[PDB]
Design a protein around this ligand. Structure first.
Ligand SMILES: CCC(=O)O[C@H](CCOCc1ccccc1)[C@@H](C)[C@H](O)[C@@H](C)CCC(=O)[C@H](C)[C@H](OC(C)=O)[C@H](C)CCN(C)C=O
Ligand SMILES: Nc1ncnc2c1ncn2[C@@H]1O[C@H](COP(=O)(O)OP(=O)(O)O)[C@@H](O)[C@H]1O
Ligand SMILES: [Ca+2]
Length: 360
């Protein structure tokens, strides 16, 4: 038998088998309900007109357990084709996921899917493992939420975790907006899926945002063309970098919040002076919203301006960081040493859902 790894994302569930290269299944974390009573994933948004879409894991934390039960059922069966009772299951959780939450995750796995063994891991922590580190600060930016998670000797430091409710979804919505100002009209849900493609293929982070704005304002050198599905060809200029600039200037979208460079900085400063140098030198970036070109070089710049002038700063941005969290779980669950760390069904029958407070 082989173990299972399920990354419960705010936008995309990444599912597969421990030991594997990448996730075997990647689909939207959406539950639709009005020839069935509930659809999950891709076909849930295809029939979005006849269904009511639910977002049970937005902002990282699971809010509806009936919806989430449907996603897990759709994952074991309709996506991975496995008997959950035959395979141990590793679930991921958001940073600062409360105790009452982990317990219900553990309860469902054993009572509703009857797994033989399970475990819950922090997503940021797994990403760091995937980069071959047990120490360093992770910037996880996904669909619905962004996190700074400093980690030392293999464990997250909850005290210094920063949560920023601004991510790829908000940038999609912003790009739709500034493209509609440009002269187009990207308003409908089907046009959101299109503007999301544009975002992922033509946007980048400007090293000097001030300079790029002025470059695009006096030359066509930063313009690209994008063909829409109906054949129409549109042109995108400064919108390419104004979109992900929002990560650094959340005021673009109307947030009083700080940029991802500041939350990274502020996160390190909450950590003990001894380990700060290790963190500065090990910024590992995780999640789809960190896939922009030149975002690493920008973090390299912005942190340097915030850190002590002597401080050695390195930004690690792995090419596979879109599945960094998943790959990490797949590595963790592949260790022999980790096998005793599973919560077994016997251990659950004897101590109940509160066993997860001593194992995870
Ligand atoms: C592609 C593989 C890879 O990236 O390698 C990583 C670093 C190791 O370097 C090479 C190596 C690997 C094995 C043997 C010798 C040398 C691995 C090993 C990671 O750092 C990671 C998977 C290790 C996990 C741990 O050591 C943590 C801290 C502990 O887990 C176990 C199995 O002992 C810890 C008890 C759990 C902490 N945790 C998950 C907190 O949330
Ligand atoms: N190459 C890319 N460039 C920019 N954004 C991307 C890219 N790939 C994925 N994304 C964005 O990342 C988000 C998905 O990230 P993910 O880490 O799966 O989120 P979560 O795991 O929190 O659900 C989506 O909003 C998507 O638009
Ligand atoms: Ca994620």
């Amino acid at each position: 038998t082989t173990a299972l790894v399920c990354d419960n994302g705010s936008g995309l569930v990444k599912a597969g088998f421990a030991g594997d290269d990448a996730p075997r299944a990647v689909f939207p974390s959406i539950v639709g309900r009005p020839q069935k009573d509930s659809y999950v994933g891709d076909e849930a948004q295809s029939k979005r007109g006849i269904l009511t879409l639910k977002y049970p894991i937005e902002h990282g934390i699971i809010t509806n357990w009936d919806d989430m039960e449907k996603i897990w059922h759709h994952t074991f069966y309709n996506e991975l084709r496995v008997a959950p009772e035959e395979h141990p299951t590793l679930l991921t959780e958001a940073p600062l996921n409360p105790k009452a939450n982990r317990e219900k995750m553990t309860q469902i796995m054993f009572e509703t899917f009857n797994v033989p063994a399970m475990y819950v891991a922090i997503q940021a922590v797994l990403s760091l493992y995937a980069s071959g580190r047990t120490t360093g600060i992770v910037l996880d930016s996904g669909d619905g939420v962004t996190h700074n998670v400093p980690i030392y000797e293999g464990y997250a430091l909850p005290h210094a975790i920063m949560r920023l409710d601004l991510a790829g979804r908000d940038l999609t919505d912003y790009l739709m907006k500034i493209l509609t100002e440009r002269g187009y009209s990207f308003v409908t849900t089907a046009e959101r899926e299109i503007v999301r493609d544009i975002k992922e293929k033509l946007c980048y982070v400007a090293l000097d945002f001030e300079n790029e704005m002025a470059t695009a304002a006096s030359s066509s050198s930063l313009e690209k063309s994008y063909e829409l599905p109906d054949g129409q060809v549109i042109t995108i200029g400064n919108e390419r970098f104004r979109c992900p600039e929002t990560l650094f200037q959340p005021s673009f979208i109307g947030m009083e919040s700080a940029g991802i460079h500041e939350t990274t900085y502020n996160s390190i400063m909450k950590c003990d002076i001894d380990i700060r140098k290790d963190l500065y030198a090990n910024n590992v970036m995780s999640g789809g919203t960190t896939m922009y070109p030149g975002i690493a070089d920008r973090m390299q710049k912005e942190i340097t301006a915030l850190a002590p002038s002597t401080m050695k700063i390195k930004i690690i941005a792995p090419p596979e960081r879109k599945y960094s969290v998943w790959i990490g779980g797949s590595i963790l669950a592949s260790l022999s040493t980790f096998q005793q760390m599973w919560i077994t069904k016997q251990e659950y029958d004897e101590a109940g859902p509160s066993i997860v407070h001593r194992k995870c």
